[PDB]
């Protein structure tokens, strides 16, 4: 409890780790260690009754996150691992169930069958793009098809449990933790033209409450980079 990293300190109280492997280190590249490893906390989203989902593309959320995000423009290459803490704080009078998946190389699908979605629809900086419970019509030129039962990938949304995941059940559980290694085909990549991870949160059983309780539940995502190293001079 009450772990710290640099000048940031969170407190916790089981951890599912990657594919059984731990994040480890690799011209001659050197590493940043003091300037980077701290808990970057994205702002909280509100889980209402008519919610559908959220997703964050992972090396895009920390693009404007300060002294890690200023390292993005000075460096052309690099490899990174992550550790994600997701916690929603409801009472013992609310009910629901979330699924917290982390998808490597999650290509999204456009709404028009001939184009490909524009950059402002794939990911916003530290803002959650949110799923929809309808179809996006084909008259939209460059928009991501956000049918939540296909998860934007053309697949069955129940079979998303093959990735590393954790079920947040409000009856029994309170938070989630995910340790994700560096998964890529090349050892160092372009970091402006590649989002090699995607964190989704999908409410399978929707929120319900009685009249008098709070009409929302906030979900707080905390990302901590591990094994951050770059190719440079």
């Amino acid at each position: 409890r009450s772990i710290t990293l640099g000048n940031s300190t969170i407190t916790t109280q089981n951890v599912v780790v990657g594919y059984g492997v731990w994040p480890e280190y690799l011209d001659q590249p050197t590493q940043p260690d003091v300037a980077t490893c701290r808990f970057y906390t994205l702002e909280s989203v509100q889980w209402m009754k008519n919610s559908a989902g959220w997703w964050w593309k992972l090396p895009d959320a920390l693009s404007q996150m300060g002294l890690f995000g200023q390292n993005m423009q000075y460096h052309y290459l690099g490899r990174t691992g992550y550790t994600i803490h997701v916690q929603c704080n409801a009472s013992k009078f609310h009910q629901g169930c979330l699924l917290v998946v982390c998808v490597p190389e999650a290509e999204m699908g456009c709404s028009n069958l001939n184009n490909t979605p524009e950059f402002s629809e794939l990911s916003g900086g530290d803002s959650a793009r949110m799923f929809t419970d309808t179809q996006v019509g084909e008259s939209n030129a460059k928009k991501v098809q956000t049918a939540v039962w296909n998860a934007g990938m053309g697949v069955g949304v129940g079979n998303l449990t093959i990735f590393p995941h954790q079920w947040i059940n409000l009856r029994t559980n309170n938070s989630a933790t995910l340790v994700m290694p560096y998964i890529n085909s090349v050892p160092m990549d372009n970091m402006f033209r590649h989002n090699n991870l995607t964190l989704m949160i999908i409410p399978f059983v929707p929120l319900n409450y009685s009249e008098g309780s709070s009409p929302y539940v906030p979900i707080t995502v905390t990302i901590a980079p591990m094994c951050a190293e770059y190719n440079g001079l």
């Binding site: 594919y19 490597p104 190389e105 290509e107 999204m108 699908g109 456009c110 028009n112 069958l113 001939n114 490909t116 179809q135 098809q145 049918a147 039962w149 296909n150 990938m153 053309g154 697949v155 069955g156 949304v157 129940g158 079979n159 998303l160 093959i162 998964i183």
Partner: peptide, 24 residues
């Protein structure tokens, strides 16, 4: 490496992964 769920909707184009939504 890295298994992945099997495709549910029909394939539409060759280059990309675009689709039209279908029932479960």
């Amino acid at each position: 490496w890295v298994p992945r769920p099997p495709r549910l909707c029909q394939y539409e184009k060759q280059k990309n992964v675009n689709f039209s939504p279908i029932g479960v």
